Swiss-Prot record:
This is Omega-conotoxin MVIIA. Disulfide bonds join 1-16, 8-20, 15-25. The record marks 4, 10, 13, 17, 19, 21 as: Binds Cav2.2/CACNA1B calcium channel. Changing residue 13 to R: Loss of inhibition of human Cav2.2/CACNA1B. The chain holds residues 46 to 70 of 71 of the full protein. The modification Cysteine amide is found at residue 25. Belongs to the conotoxin O1 superfamily. It is found in: Secreted. The presence of a 'disulfide through disulfide knot' structurally defines this protein as a knottin. Changing residue 14 to N: In omega-3; 2.8-fold increase in inhibition of Cav2.2/CACNA1B and decrease in efficacy to kill goldfish (LD(50) is 0.20 mg/kg by intramuscular injection).
Amino acid sequence: CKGKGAKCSRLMYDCCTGSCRSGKC
């Protein structure tokens, strides 16, 4: 997954807790 402050994506809620903010977990 991705930690809160990771380069997430709008189409990828890769963060462990769906923390993704359209690109920032």
